[PDB]
Amino acid sequence: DQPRHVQYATHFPIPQEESCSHECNQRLVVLFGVGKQRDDARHAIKKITKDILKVLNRKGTAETDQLAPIVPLNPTFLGGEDGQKRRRNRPEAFPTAEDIFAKFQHLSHYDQHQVTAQVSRNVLEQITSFALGMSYHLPLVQHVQFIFDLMEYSLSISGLIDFAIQLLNELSVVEAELLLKSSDLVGSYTTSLCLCIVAVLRHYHACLILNQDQMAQVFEGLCGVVKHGMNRSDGSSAERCILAYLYDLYTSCSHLKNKFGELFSDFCSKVKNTIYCNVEPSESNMRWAPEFMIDTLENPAAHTFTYTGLGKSLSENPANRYSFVCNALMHVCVGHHDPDRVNDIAILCAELTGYCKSLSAEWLGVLKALCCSSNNGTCGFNDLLCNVDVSDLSFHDSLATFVAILIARQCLLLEDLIRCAAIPSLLNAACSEQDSEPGARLTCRILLHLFKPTVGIRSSCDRHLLAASQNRIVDGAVFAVLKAVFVLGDSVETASLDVYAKYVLRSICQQEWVGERCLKSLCEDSNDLQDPVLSSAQAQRLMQLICYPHRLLDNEDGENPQRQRIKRILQNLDQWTMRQSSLELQLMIKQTPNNEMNSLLENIAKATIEVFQQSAETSLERSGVWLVAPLIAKLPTSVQGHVLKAAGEELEKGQHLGSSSRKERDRQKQKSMSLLSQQPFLSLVLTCLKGQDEQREGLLTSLYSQVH
């Protein structure tokens, strides 16, 4: 049939545009050959996407389009896919088309040019029409969500920088022509679309670093236009991550401004200075101040309210804790499990507390109350089990989705959970066994839901939100919360109760993002995993889980399972994971107790001397043992020096076996060379000859042995 190379003909993309107008456009077609299809392929590839925009550009109704599946006689499989697009009729929870899925499968960068040029003509015709004298209508938001969910299949890179370029350019045109009108519609749909571009560039962090020769200096131009004129509703959009994440560019030129405020000079200095030095918080306490029945008075639909006016309202009382927690939980037990309701209640309540950044440090009481008995009271929790169904887990996906929405705000800090949550959970099971027994398993499942057998879910836009916000928290103490899970232990439903304590060990490490953070963390330093809080036996029983998930499951076997565990640490590593393969040794070498340092030397010496004899008696696959020397070289030579100076004479005694026939002496020589024909022997003593005492005695014995 077909060979392998014909499938990759479509897998050769050209990312850079405008290569050669006369040459590259005209010469590329004739490589495959002639075809009527390819000429009509260009005729209808834009036609299928122009129709859906012309009813959006001109706001054409859907009732005027009925003859689109009726006219074309050819609906072939791509053409017939055009006709079925009118079978869905009304909008629904409809997946993408198979062709658009197939463009994610193959040819994702050839077609990325037309779709990015398709949206380029849409965003530029409006800017010639918004200023044409009639269009003062703000851009809609309902089409924004569906257009990022479909553009991401092409793996676009050029679609990010151009839109960021054009939006800052057009707003300077707006202020020169639309500032004097002074309307009240400013910032309702532009600021919402402002953070959409910022967040999608955060998911494309490689593209934002290559344009730094005008990135920083444009922000004074685009933000400074509103201040010099009569500024209405100040600036609705303010950048937050710029003044903290950028460090390198300020060494060129640094300048100061003096147009902030009489008491806001220190305030707006700290608006830019958000790196450290937290100011003194709200001294008035925020515990049990609101009682009940206050959410009906306020309307979050009116977006015209401001953060500055919110300060005077909360200056009277910081009372935004209790009456909204009860309002939220009473509402969610009224509404159904439909996806529209559960996502909206998290995001609408978010902007109430989004500018209430002091409210971000008081949410611990929803878990601190049930964890400890310092709150006292027994009847306060019985109703909280009356409204919880523990048997059903399909509706626990919604609260698993809520905490994904809760972590997606990127301004809620969970650094209190390291100190005051995982540590007493050790003593929670230690002090009480039959009383707080659900506390171990309830904290087991909810942390799994934070870091999600598996089934392929269609969700992709919010699926990538969990890993994007993961690295925003430092990795200094997060694994201490992880280890506190592991040290506490010391058909899915068919499993019994006791076996779940062991599958959680695998399932936590099953996530590829869990494993890769531990692998990268040791690249800088290992002092954080040598803390005496960490366990002895349980630490290295999961290093083989840390290193690779797709390896075969090693089994507990025999009276001496560590005997074969020492003997396979050479074979299991390959010639490509050379970084962490030697890193696992010095952790378990130092974990070995001091009473058996003597037995811990000759094992690694003799491990490398029967790795050569099985090829002596009877290339790139065998290049791994031909290149174990880089692993040995990146080791403390105090251990290496004693075990390799011992390796010399035991391989210089391998040829010294006589007391038999003359002819067997020659065979035991040449079998010894075939296991001693390794250039790494010359390099292992090369490490050893630095920082040694004397090793000239061993080769004296060989010289004398053969001189006769």
XYZ file of C-alpha atoms in Angstrom:
708
model
C 0.000 0.000 0.000
C 1.071 3.574 0.688
C 4.490 4.165 2.289
C 5.084 6.275 5.377
C 6.479 9.315 3.544
C 3.332 10.109 1.537
C 1.396 10.805 4.753
C 3.861 13.543 5.749
C 3.545 15.506 2.490
C 0.718 17.467 4.126
C 2.867 17.774 7.284
C 5.277 20.355 5.818
C 3.923 23.808 6.759
C 5.148 27.288 5.882
C 4.532 29.596 8.866
C 6.087 32.819 7.547
C 3.863 34.793 5.177
C 4.843 36.781 2.056
C 7.700 34.541 0.942
C 7.649 35.118 -2.839
C 4.611 36.546 -4.629
C 5.669 35.636 -8.168
C 7.590 32.472 -7.225
C 6.290 30.759 -4.073
C 2.603 31.173 -4.934
C 3.052 30.076 -8.553
C 5.566 27.225 -8.126
C 3.992 25.376 -5.178
C 0.990 23.943 -7.052
C 2.905 22.108 -9.804
C 4.909 19.949 -7.371
C 2.131 17.384 -6.926
C 0.682 17.799 -10.417
C -2.358 19.265 -12.124
C -5.898 19.199 -10.773
C -9.294 20.828 -11.251
C -10.109 20.167 -7.578
C -7.344 22.389 -6.170
C -8.551 25.353 -8.232
C -12.124 24.891 -7.004
C -10.758 24.111 -3.530
C -9.708 27.760 -3.287
C -13.078 28.772 -4.770
C -15.130 27.393 -1.863
C -12.776 27.377 1.152
C -13.518 31.069 1.757
C -17.142 30.703 0.613
C -18.060 28.420 3.532
C -16.737 31.005 6.025
C -17.880 34.209 4.289
C -21.572 33.279 4.557
C -21.530 32.948 8.353
C -19.813 36.348 8.629
C -21.979 38.218 6.105
C -25.037 37.417 8.240
C -22.959 38.797 11.126
C -21.366 41.730 9.275
C -24.687 42.864 7.787
C -26.710 41.247 10.634
C -28.596 39.070 8.166
C -31.288 36.858 9.638
C -31.093 33.070 9.652
C -34.524 32.799 8.006
C -33.188 34.209 4.718
C -30.812 31.229 4.283
C -32.646 28.067 3.218
C -31.364 27.353 -0.303
C -27.727 26.854 0.762
C -28.002 23.016 1.033
C -30.410 22.893 -1.921
C -28.343 24.665 -4.604
C -25.063 22.694 -4.755
C -25.349 19.531 -6.839
C -22.064 17.925 -5.731
C -23.170 17.415 -2.100
C -17.539 15.484 -2.144
C -17.123 14.474 1.498
C -15.907 18.005 2.224
C -18.671 19.404 0.024
C -21.270 17.155 1.644
C -20.087 18.441 5.019
C -21.289 21.895 3.955
C -24.886 20.744 3.491
C -25.180 19.141 6.934
C -24.445 22.455 8.687
C -28.137 23.374 8.304
C -29.260 20.129 9.984
C -28.502 21.458 13.479
C -31.044 24.288 12.885
C -31.279 26.155 16.187
C -28.110 26.674 18.265
C -27.415 23.975 20.833
C -24.532 22.311 22.668
C -23.074 21.428 19.284
C -19.501 20.163 18.870
C -17.265 21.341 16.060
C -17.484 19.966 12.538
C -15.441 16.931 11.529
C -13.577 18.975 8.895
C -12.524 21.538 11.510
C -11.523 18.606 13.721
C -9.629 17.167 10.740
C -7.807 20.483 10.335
C -6.615 19.993 13.904
C -5.571 16.499 12.785
C -3.768 17.598 9.610
C -2.866 20.823 7.761
C -3.320 23.258 10.647
C -0.843 25.928 9.488
C -1.645 26.161 5.772
C -5.258 27.102 6.551
C -4.261 29.392 9.443
C -3.424 32.161 6.953
C -6.928 32.539 5.516
C -8.774 32.465 8.856
C -6.420 35.033 10.423
C -6.879 37.174 7.312
C -10.627 36.517 7.598
C -10.775 38.092 11.057
C -8.313 40.806 9.990
C -10.749 42.176 7.406
C -13.568 42.063 9.967
C -11.697 44.041 12.636
C -10.477 46.656 10.130
C -13.680 47.276 8.173
C -15.417 48.175 11.439
C -12.669 50.644 12.350
C -13.347 52.254 8.966
C -17.059 52.108 9.861
C -17.045 52.987 13.576
C -15.401 56.282 12.591
C -17.505 56.607 9.421
C -20.118 58.580 11.383
C -22.920 56.126 12.192
C -21.498 53.069 13.974
C -21.175 53.931 17.658
C -22.269 50.443 18.719
C -20.035 48.520 21.095
C -18.644 45.128 20.008
C -20.665 42.137 21.149
C -19.280 39.523 23.531
C -21.506 36.548 22.666
C -19.458 35.710 19.550
C -16.082 36.113 21.293
C -16.285 32.829 23.222
C -17.149 30.719 20.171
C -14.343 32.226 18.074
C -11.456 31.348 20.418
C -12.744 27.787 20.868
C -12.408 27.177 17.111
C -9.285 29.199 16.243
C -7.101 27.155 18.628
C -7.186 24.078 16.355
C -4.788 25.786 13.925
C -2.140 26.309 16.671
C -1.911 29.926 15.562
C 1.053 32.123 16.485
C 0.571 35.136 14.184
C -2.980 35.792 15.423
C -1.865 37.197 18.788
C 0.651 39.967 18.062
C -1.375 41.612 15.279
C -4.539 42.080 17.347
C -2.511 43.482 20.247
C -0.882 45.869 17.762
C -4.141 47.049 16.189
C -6.122 47.693 19.384
C -3.589 50.117 20.877
C -3.377 51.927 17.533
C -7.122 52.410 17.068
C -7.798 53.743 20.581
C -5.502 56.706 19.920
C -7.704 57.421 16.899
C -10.758 57.144 19.175
C -9.513 59.725 21.691
C -8.787 62.229 18.909
C -12.364 61.895 17.587
C -14.671 60.386 20.246
C -13.456 61.858 23.555
C -15.408 65.111 23.159
C -18.766 63.302 22.964
C -18.360 62.129 26.604
C -20.899 59.302 26.613
C -21.627 56.791 29.396
C -21.061 53.557 27.426
C -17.273 53.508 27.900
C -15.575 50.367 29.176
C -18.585 48.033 29.277
C -17.472 45.858 26.343
C -13.936 47.132 25.693
C -12.560 46.384 29.174
C -14.215 42.953 29.113
C -12.524 42.338 25.760
C -9.315 43.890 27.126
C -8.608 41.123 29.643
C -9.618 38.477 27.090
C -6.575 39.358 24.970
C -4.326 39.545 28.050
C -5.380 36.092 29.281
C -5.000 34.389 25.892
C -1.490 35.837 25.549
C -0.681 34.420 28.995
C -1.447 30.983 27.523
C 0.962 31.852 24.660
C 3.842 33.146 26.776
C 6.487 32.447 24.111
C 4.975 34.977 21.689
C 4.922 37.942 24.096
C 8.695 37.851 24.726
C 9.854 38.423 21.121
C 8.436 41.963 20.708
C 10.150 43.834 23.542
C 11.533 46.682 21.401
C 8.165 48.457 21.599
C 6.268 46.433 24.241
C 6.997 48.521 27.341
C 7.014 52.059 25.927
C 3.549 51.936 24.330
C 1.675 51.697 27.658
C 2.382 55.336 28.522
C 1.018 56.367 25.123
C -2.139 54.257 25.181
C -3.000 55.017 28.817
C -1.790 58.625 28.856
C -4.238 59.869 26.223
C -7.216 59.925 28.598
C -5.584 61.922 31.394
C -4.536 65.083 29.536
C -8.041 65.601 28.201
C -11.146 65.818 30.327
C -11.091 62.280 31.703
C -14.544 60.754 32.211
C -14.851 57.661 34.451
C -10.981 57.744 34.605
C -9.487 54.687 32.854
C -11.643 51.570 33.025
C -8.704 49.367 31.971
C -5.535 49.160 34.073
C -2.682 46.701 33.604
C -1.621 44.759 36.685
C 1.032 42.160 35.795
C 3.195 44.536 33.724
C 4.929 46.467 36.515
C 5.876 43.293 38.441
C 6.715 40.589 35.885
C 9.029 42.858 33.856
C 12.511 43.299 35.371
C 15.078 43.407 32.546
C 13.836 46.339 30.462
C 14.105 48.992 33.198
C 17.922 48.982 33.203
C 17.883 50.957 29.944
C 16.069 54.094 31.139
C 14.151 54.676 34.377
C 11.908 57.712 34.839
C 9.536 58.964 37.534
C 6.157 60.701 37.329
C 4.588 63.315 39.607
C 0.910 63.493 38.585
C -0.794 61.067 40.986
C -2.268 62.667 44.121
C -1.925 64.600 47.378
C -2.402 61.405 49.413
C -2.543 59.073 46.398
C 1.129 59.674 45.595
C 1.996 56.898 48.035
C -1.125 54.988 46.954
C -0.447 55.034 43.222
C 3.249 54.374 43.796
C 2.086 51.089 45.323
C -0.252 50.642 42.345
C 2.882 50.148 40.249
C 4.834 48.617 43.161
C 2.938 45.363 43.747
C 5.921 43.012 44.106
C 6.142 42.824 47.918
C 5.692 44.817 51.167
C 2.027 44.152 51.864
C 0.316 47.163 53.427
C -1.496 46.927 56.770
C -4.869 45.204 56.145
C -8.371 46.177 57.264
C -8.008 46.391 61.043
C -11.761 45.982 61.552
C -12.546 42.277 61.829
C -14.736 40.507 59.269
C -16.187 37.635 61.335
C -19.976 37.165 61.718
C -20.756 40.811 60.912
C -23.506 40.249 58.271
C -26.375 38.098 59.440
C -28.977 37.515 56.710
C -31.082 38.868 53.845
C -28.998 41.571 52.195
C -28.354 40.349 48.608
C -31.794 41.389 47.308
C -31.084 45.102 47.838
C -28.014 45.181 45.579
C -28.140 44.527 41.832
C -24.918 43.167 40.259
C -26.435 43.667 36.782
C -25.730 47.410 36.977
C -22.045 47.534 36.018
C -21.793 51.312 36.529
C -20.771 51.016 40.198
C -17.091 51.569 40.970
C -14.358 50.311 43.287
C -13.760 53.766 44.779
C -17.409 54.129 45.781
C -17.282 50.599 47.189
C -14.714 51.777 49.739
C -17.102 54.194 51.456
C -19.829 51.533 51.634
C -17.443 49.067 53.292
C -15.872 51.811 55.424
C -19.119 51.726 57.404
C -18.800 47.953 57.875
C -16.590 45.165 56.420
C -19.492 42.705 56.377
C -19.200 40.648 53.173
C -18.728 37.106 54.541
C -21.752 35.351 56.029
C -24.898 36.609 54.271
C -23.532 35.679 50.826
C -22.213 32.228 51.751
C -25.692 31.290 52.983
C -27.268 32.962 49.939
C -25.025 30.973 47.585
C -25.627 27.567 49.183
C -29.383 28.108 49.490
C -29.524 29.098 45.817
C -27.497 26.145 44.497
C -29.874 23.735 46.256
C -32.748 25.477 44.441
C -31.349 25.537 40.907
C -30.693 22.440 38.830
C -27.404 20.887 37.654
C -27.493 22.652 34.278
C -24.058 23.923 33.171
C -25.206 27.491 32.432
C -26.304 28.236 36.004
C -23.244 26.863 37.811
C -20.656 28.739 35.736
C -22.507 32.062 35.953
C -22.948 32.109 39.740
C -19.193 31.744 40.256
C -18.209 34.488 37.807
C -20.930 37.004 38.735
C -20.151 36.687 42.448
C -16.443 36.964 41.585
C -16.594 40.603 40.467
C -18.317 41.552 43.731
C -15.205 40.350 45.587
C -12.685 40.773 42.757
C -11.851 44.350 43.712
C -12.342 43.353 47.368
C -8.783 42.057 47.557
C -8.904 42.098 51.366
C -11.712 39.529 51.065
C -9.168 37.171 49.451
C -7.587 36.508 52.880
C -10.707 35.460 54.816
C -12.187 32.473 52.935
C -10.478 29.900 55.197
C -13.418 29.796 57.633
C -15.491 27.537 55.380
C -12.937 24.767 56.002
C -11.466 25.900 59.338
C -14.862 25.495 61.029
C -15.340 21.788 60.286
C -11.667 20.799 60.577
C -11.194 21.862 64.209
C -13.428 21.689 67.275
C -12.331 25.130 68.529
C -15.577 26.510 67.076
C -17.455 24.047 69.362
C -21.058 23.055 68.700
C -22.420 19.759 67.379
C -25.738 20.694 65.746
C -24.001 23.157 63.411
C -22.878 20.352 61.092
C -25.840 17.932 61.014
C -27.761 20.069 58.515
C -24.559 20.311 56.458
C -24.746 16.540 55.941
C -28.502 16.693 55.286
C -27.886 18.606 52.032
C -24.856 16.564 50.870
C -25.178 13.395 48.783
C -21.924 11.458 49.135
C -22.992 8.512 46.941
C -23.422 10.597 43.782
C -20.231 11.912 42.171
C -21.546 13.188 38.821
C -22.787 16.369 40.508
C -19.459 16.617 42.357
C -17.958 17.513 38.971
C -19.742 20.877 39.245
C -17.984 21.772 42.497
C -14.874 20.305 40.885
C -15.572 22.754 38.056
C -16.268 25.552 40.555
C -12.846 25.244 42.192
C -11.373 25.354 38.683
C -13.271 28.619 38.223
C -12.264 29.621 41.765
C -8.563 29.117 40.948
C -8.872 30.855 37.550
C -9.166 34.372 39.032
C -5.328 34.439 39.565
C -5.638 36.784 42.563
C -6.709 34.290 45.265
C -3.690 33.126 47.264
C -3.690 29.723 48.983
C -0.460 30.186 50.952
C -2.377 29.884 54.230
C -3.259 26.278 53.343
C 0.359 25.069 53.597
C 0.760 25.935 57.276
C -2.675 25.442 58.846
C -4.410 22.702 56.818
C -2.206 19.714 55.965
C -0.166 19.625 59.193
C -3.095 19.169 61.660
C -4.587 16.606 59.254
C -1.738 14.322 60.342
C -2.771 14.766 63.975
C -6.447 14.699 62.962
C -6.171 10.998 62.141
C -3.544 10.473 64.858
C -5.555 11.871 67.773
C -8.942 10.585 66.558
C -9.542 7.370 64.602
C -13.288 6.620 64.638
C -14.454 10.255 64.924
C -12.694 12.166 62.118
C -12.456 9.159 59.793
C -14.207 10.912 56.832
C -11.707 13.777 57.113
C -8.968 11.678 55.524
C -11.108 10.468 52.614
C -12.929 13.777 52.045
C -9.633 15.650 51.745
C -8.475 12.752 49.555
C -11.107 13.224 46.847
C -11.336 17.031 46.732
C -7.601 17.478 46.107
C -7.873 14.944 43.282
C -10.665 17.062 41.788
C -8.421 20.140 41.970
C -5.711 18.364 39.944
C -7.518 16.099 37.483
C -9.749 6.253 34.829
C -10.265 9.083 32.327
C -12.653 9.782 29.446
C -11.979 12.273 26.655
C -13.979 15.413 27.463
C -14.802 17.956 24.752
C -13.841 20.824 27.090
C -10.566 22.401 25.955
C -10.694 26.154 26.662
C -11.274 25.786 30.404
C -9.273 22.540 30.452
C -6.063 24.509 29.864
C -6.861 26.965 32.680
C -5.724 24.544 35.404
C -2.128 24.194 34.185
C -1.753 27.864 33.207
C -2.394 29.060 36.775
C -0.397 26.221 38.372
C 3.047 27.844 38.123
C 1.767 31.154 39.551
C 2.246 29.649 43.036
C 5.844 29.004 44.086
C 6.918 25.375 44.441
C 8.815 25.932 47.693
C 6.144 24.528 50.011
C 3.396 23.030 47.817
C 4.992 19.568 47.831
C 5.046 19.679 51.636
C 1.254 19.637 51.399
C 1.664 16.802 48.894
C 4.008 14.825 51.175
C 1.580 15.332 54.076
C -0.911 13.335 52.005
C 1.606 10.537 51.398
C 2.948 10.288 54.957
C -0.548 10.230 56.499
C -1.361 6.984 54.692
C 1.964 5.429 55.812
C -15.382 -0.410 37.510
C -14.264 2.037 40.195
C -17.025 1.190 42.688
C -16.051 -2.498 42.943
C -12.972 -1.641 45.030
C -13.121 -2.195 48.782
C -12.382 0.432 51.436
C -8.801 -0.498 52.335
C -7.422 -0.554 48.780
C -8.211 3.136 48.114
C -5.330 4.118 50.413
C -2.887 2.686 47.834
C -4.454 3.775 44.533
C -4.372 7.413 45.695
C -0.578 7.014 45.739
C -0.624 6.288 41.998
C -3.533 8.557 41.045
C -1.948 11.704 42.501
C 1.293 10.938 40.645
C -0.668 9.753 37.575
C -1.054 13.357 36.377
C 1.782 14.303 34.035
C 1.843 17.834 35.472
C 2.357 16.406 38.970
C 5.361 14.400 37.794
C 7.005 17.091 35.673
C 7.082 19.686 38.466
C 9.035 17.302 40.705
C 11.440 16.487 37.858
C 12.209 20.143 37.137
C 12.453 21.095 40.828
C 15.600 19.026 41.396
C 17.307 20.698 38.419
C 17.972 23.802 40.528
C 18.385 22.373 44.039
C 17.592 19.329 46.173
C 17.796 21.000 49.606
C 13.997 21.231 49.818
C 13.480 17.446 49.647
C 16.168 16.683 52.256
C 14.159 18.272 55.077
C 13.910 16.029 58.178
C 10.102 16.291 58.065
C 10.161 14.004 55.009
C 9.912 10.257 55.587
C 12.705 7.711 55.164
C 11.173 4.559 53.675
C 8.254 6.277 51.925
C 10.386 8.872 50.114
C 12.231 6.572 47.712
C 9.412 4.075 47.160
C 7.887 6.708 44.848
C 11.020 7.932 43.035
C 10.344 5.216 40.456
C 6.838 6.687 40.304
C 8.344 10.177 39.944
C 10.720 9.204 37.127
C 8.332 7.522 34.684
C 4.594 6.692 34.653
C 4.605 4.596 31.464
C 7.121 2.045 32.761
C 5.965 -1.448 33.685
C 4.615 -1.712 37.223
C 7.400 -3.095 39.403
C 6.155 -5.680 41.886
C 6.794 -6.372 45.552
C 8.356 -9.824 45.588
C 10.619 -12.073 47.610
C 12.159 -11.840 51.055
C 14.791 -9.425 49.665
C 13.079 -7.041 47.213
C 15.848 -4.447 47.517
C 18.360 -6.992 46.189
C 16.930 -6.885 42.678
C 16.123 -3.197 43.171
C 19.835 -2.417 43.465
C 20.664 -4.623 40.490
C 18.356 -3.009 37.897
C 19.018 0.722 38.491
C 21.604 0.486 35.707
C 19.478 -1.233 33.049
C 16.241 0.706 33.586
C 17.754 4.094 32.740
C 18.465 4.929 29.105
C 20.946 7.138 27.245
C 18.484 10.060 27.105
C 17.205 10.644 30.659
C 20.746 11.217 31.942
C 19.693 14.174 34.111
C 17.547 12.554 36.818
C 18.788 8.962 36.411
C 21.890 9.600 38.513
C 19.931 11.987 40.758
C 17.949 9.151 42.353
C 21.131 7.522 43.678
C 22.519 10.016 46.205
C 19.080 10.341 47.797
C 18.887 6.582 48.391
C 22.641 6.307 49.004
C 22.317 8.742 51.913
C 19.053 7.061 52.955
C 21.004 3.840 53.535
C 21.949 3.661 57.244
C 25.530 4.265 58.349
C 26.004 0.681 59.598
C 26.273 -0.585 55.996
C 28.477 1.912 54.185
C 30.931 -0.970 53.723
C 28.393 -3.074 51.807
C 27.284 0.012 49.852
C 30.633 0.465 48.045
C 31.406 -2.809 46.248
C 27.826 -3.205 44.972
C 28.166 -0.356 42.466
C 31.730 -1.487 41.754
C 30.629 -5.007 40.832
C 27.402 -3.874 39.144
C 29.460 -2.677 36.170
C 31.620 -5.810 35.856
C 28.897 -8.349 34.986
C 27.278 -5.823 32.651
C 30.101 -6.535 30.175
C 30.555 -10.310 30.555
C 27.230 -11.226 28.908
C 28.427 -9.607 25.676
C 31.986 -10.906 26.121
C 31.028 -14.593 26.018
C 28.618 -14.273 23.082
C 25.437 -0.631 18.773
C 23.255 2.378 19.550
C 21.105 0.177 21.783
C 24.347 -0.881 23.488
C 25.631 2.714 23.473
C 23.865 3.292 26.802
C 26.263 1.098 28.773
C 28.955 2.516 26.470
C 27.980 5.929 27.911
C 27.285 5.387 31.614
C 30.431 7.440 32.288
C 28.570 10.822 32.141
C 26.308 9.524 34.922
C 29.340 8.407 36.935
C 31.262 11.637 36.256
C 28.505 13.830 37.737
C 28.928 12.213 41.153
C 30.919 12.997 44.314
C 34.250 11.337 43.583
C 34.855 10.327 47.218
C 32.413 7.453 46.747
C 33.485 7.021 43.110
C 37.214 6.941 43.853
C 37.082 4.090 46.363
C 34.785 1.899 44.251
C 36.660 2.385 40.961
C 40.159 1.886 42.352
C 38.691 -1.381 43.645
C 37.251 -2.053 40.184
C 40.715 -1.996 38.630
C 42.403 -4.930 40.354
C 39.315 -7.147 40.264
C 39.372 -6.709 36.492
C 43.150 -7.166 36.690
C 42.502 -10.453 38.507
C 39.997 -11.620 35.884
C 42.794 -12.539 33.490
C 44.791 -14.195 36.314
C 43.171 -17.650 36.299
C 45.670 -20.422 35.590
C 46.298 -23.933 36.985
C 44.798 -25.487 33.845
C 45.664 -26.128 30.197
C 47.659 -23.674 28.097
C 44.903 -23.203 25.518
C 42.211 -22.282 28.051
C 44.511 -19.496 29.278
C 44.260 -17.752 25.902
C 40.456 -18.013 25.863
C 40.055 -16.562 29.364
C 42.284 -13.702 28.225
C 40.200 -12.794 25.162
C 36.931 -13.170 27.075
C 38.371 -10.762 29.654
C 39.281 -8.186 26.985
C 35.799 -8.342 25.451
C 34.425 -7.357 28.868
C 37.281 -4.828 29.293
C 37.215 -3.257 25.802
C 35.399 -0.162 27.071
C 36.721 3.388 26.643
C 34.613 4.354 29.768
C 37.255 2.459 31.765
C 39.725 5.148 30.702
C 37.245 7.887 31.637
C 36.205 6.493 35.027
C 39.814 6.594 36.215
C 40.030 10.023 34.562
C 37.625 11.208 37.245
C 39.571 9.163 39.796
C 43.035 10.541 38.965
C 41.858 13.936 40.263
C 41.894 13.997 44.054
C 43.582 10.607 44.528
C 46.519 9.302 46.547
C 48.253 6.594 44.445
C 47.070 3.875 42.037
C 50.289 2.797 40.266
C 50.397 -0.611 41.983
C 47.663 -2.329 39.969
C 49.252 -2.041 36.539
C 52.546 -3.233 38.043
C 50.921 -6.640 38.535
C 49.777 -6.853 34.908
C 53.164 -5.842 33.482
C 54.872 -8.617 35.445
C 52.166 -11.142 34.563
C 52.726 -10.813 30.799
C 56.475 -10.129 30.656
C 56.950 -13.891 31.060
